[PDB]
Amino acid sequence: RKKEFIMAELLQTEKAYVRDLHECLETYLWEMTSGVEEIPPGILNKEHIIFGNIQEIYDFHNNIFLKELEKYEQLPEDVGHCFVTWADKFQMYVTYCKNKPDSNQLILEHAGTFFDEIQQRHGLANSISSYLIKPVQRVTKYQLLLKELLTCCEEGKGELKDGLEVMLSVPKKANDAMH
Amino acid sequence: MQAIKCVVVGDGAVGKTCLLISYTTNAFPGEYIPTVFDNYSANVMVDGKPVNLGLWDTAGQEDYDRLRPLSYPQTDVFLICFSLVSPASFENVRAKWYPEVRHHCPNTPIILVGTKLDLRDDKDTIEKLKEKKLTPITYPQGLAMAKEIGAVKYLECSALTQRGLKTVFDEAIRAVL
Numbered sequence: 001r002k003k004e005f006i007m008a009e010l011l012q013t014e015k016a017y018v019r020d021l022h023e024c025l026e027t028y029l030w031e032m033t034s035g036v037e038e039i040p041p042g043i044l045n046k047e048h049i050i051f052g053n054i055q056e057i058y059d060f061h062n063n064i065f066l067k068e069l070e071k072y073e074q075l076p077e078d079v080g081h082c083f084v085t086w087a088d089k090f091q092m093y094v095t096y097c098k099n100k101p102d103s104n105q106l107i108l109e110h111a112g113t114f115f116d117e118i119q120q121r122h123g124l125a126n127s128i129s130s131y132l133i134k135p136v137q138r139v140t141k142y143q144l145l146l147k148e149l150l151t152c153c154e155e156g157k158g159e160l161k162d163g164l165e166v167m168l169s170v171p172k173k174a175n176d177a178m179h
Numbered sequence: 180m181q182a183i184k185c186v187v188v189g190d191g192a193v194g195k196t197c198l199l200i201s202y203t204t205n206a207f208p209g210e211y212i213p214t215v216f217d218n219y220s221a222n223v224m225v226d227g228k229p230v231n232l233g234l235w236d237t238a239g240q241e242d243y244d245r246l247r248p249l250s251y252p253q254t255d256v257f258l259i260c261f262s263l264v265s266p267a268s269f270e271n272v273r274a275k276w277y278p279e280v281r282h283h284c285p286n287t288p289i290i291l292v293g294t295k296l297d298l299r300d301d302k303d304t305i306e307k308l309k310e311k312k313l314t315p316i317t318y319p320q321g322l323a324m325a326k327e328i329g330a331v332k333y334l335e336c337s338a339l340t341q342r343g344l345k346t347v348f349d350e351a352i353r354a355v356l
């Protein structure tokens with residue numbers, strides 16, 4: 001029952017993370033790359049700095065990771081292996097975290113209200129800043145869900161230990177990469 | 180209409196995620212405590228004036244000293260939290276949370292929040308603490324800590340009973356208006 005609540009949350013919040021990154025790319029990013037609106041000289045052609053590698057992170061989750069997590073729905077005690085299999089992909093959170101300060105200053109110093117106007121126009125509860133923190137939140141959350149599964153899975157549960165190891169290592173590597 | 184970004188910080192033992200879930204759903208989650216609270220916004224009215232309240236959790240970032248501050252810029256008000264039945268979490272207000280919040284956000288208001296109010300009078304909790312030569316954190320201790328860190332308010336709440344819970348977020352909004 002508890003391992004099933006945790007697996008359900010893992011999947012529901014993965015679906016929400018994918019919907020969130022998709023919204024960010026098809027509103028805030030699309031307005032910059034589109035050519036439908038006038039872009040502050042401050043940020044013109046600096047979407048690379050603003051959004052970092054969030055496209056590549058979304059492609060991983062949307063093309064691969066959510067589909068593979070779904071295949072472990074009835075195998076919660078094994079889901080640590082999903083993180084071991086895809087460990088290399090999570091390295092792009094190191095790149096994302098490294099960039100995030102530069103992203104935030106660029107939006108502060110040079111974007112004025114470009115993104116606030118987009119937010120209002122689209123009717124979004126979440127600001128560009130709310131969306132751009134999400135990869136940092138998600139990558140520090142997987143380790144909490146795996147710790148929860150460890151409190152309620154037998155010991156056929158080194159298919160959690162190794163997964164958790166990976167999902168402790170990634171955020172620590174990302175942390176250790178900051179200025 | 181005034182947008183407010185409120186970040187919730189403090190040790191894992193505060194139950195940050197449970198606090199935020201119990202507040203936004205008007206219910207202790209009970210069955211299962213979710214680990215995920217995604218960035219949230221709602222209209223609340225405070226002293227008449229309606230307001231858009233933004234809540235960010237930080238659960239999972241407790242060990243990542245350089246990632247935590249990525250949430251800090253342009254915060255309107257911080258909740259710095261400790262558990263009333265974890266003396267280590269209370270000391271960490273002083274050792275850990277206040278220093279980094281002040282470093283990144285010098286002029287941003289702090290509400291000091293003591294969570295797990297319902298456990299301060301719980302025999303099993305009290306005895307578990309006595310066996311480690313500790314007691315729960317009492318009201319004057321939180322008042323003293325509030326003064327030491329420049330907190331605009333010291334407030335005590337239970338996610339479990341909802342005692343003082345709605346007041347925490349009312350006072351976070353009033354710290355900004």
Ligand SMILES: Cc1cc(NC(=O)Nc2cnn(Cc3cn4ccccc4n3)c2)no1
Nearest residue numbers: 193194197198294295296297336337338339
């Ligand atoms: C964020 C937050 C939570 C909160 N108050 C609680 O969670 N109180 C509470 C009382 N019973 N339970 C389930 C349970 C079983 N337990 C055994 C020993 C000790 C604690 C314990 N909790 C929860 N106030 O704020």
